[PDB]
Amino acid sequence: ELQEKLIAVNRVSKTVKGGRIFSFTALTVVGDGNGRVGFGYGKAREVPAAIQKAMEKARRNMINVALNNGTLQHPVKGVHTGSRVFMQPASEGTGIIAGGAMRAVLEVAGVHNVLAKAYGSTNPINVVRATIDGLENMNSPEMVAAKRGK
């Protein structure tokens, strides 16, 4: 149950006396399938180097999120830089409908049946990230009782 997938691979340019020196960047997401998900970025002069150098970063850099069986407990909003993301429980019929790129984090995460949309820029590096922190801030469908009960 490794389960991983890269979301966006891109090229960039550095520019020096001798001209442009190009490079690449991968952005990836690994999840266990039962909560626990992280993303990694990582960049390198050539693509395979970078997509791999990324996968690892994600293995570390990994949060975990309090699911509720196949779905989220309540609805949540996430918002990093220019991306404002919103995703919702959805008493699954099928579900998992969302902006491929946050479908990525959502399935490896293990959510099985949510609807989402991304507002603002769909800049991958900031959505997959806005959603993570999104799922992250999410909270205990029980241990709000922790907070209260008391």
Place this chain on the structure above:
RNA sequence: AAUUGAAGAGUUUGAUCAUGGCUCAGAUUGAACGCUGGCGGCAGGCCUAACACAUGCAAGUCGAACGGUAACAGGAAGAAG
């Protein structure tokens, strides 16, 4: 049981993030045109000039309201084919 349902992509930059317009995937149509074209079922068919219109047809019916016979039908004292 009976609205229990939401995706994003391309494009300013050497490159970047943002701002932002343009653009695309969708569905829908009383449609036209180019190419092509076998059959059926249900449907639709002047969106323009409330422009103008030849011709037929689109409102008649009742003799159980009435005087009635001109048509075609029988029939009639009776005049006969």
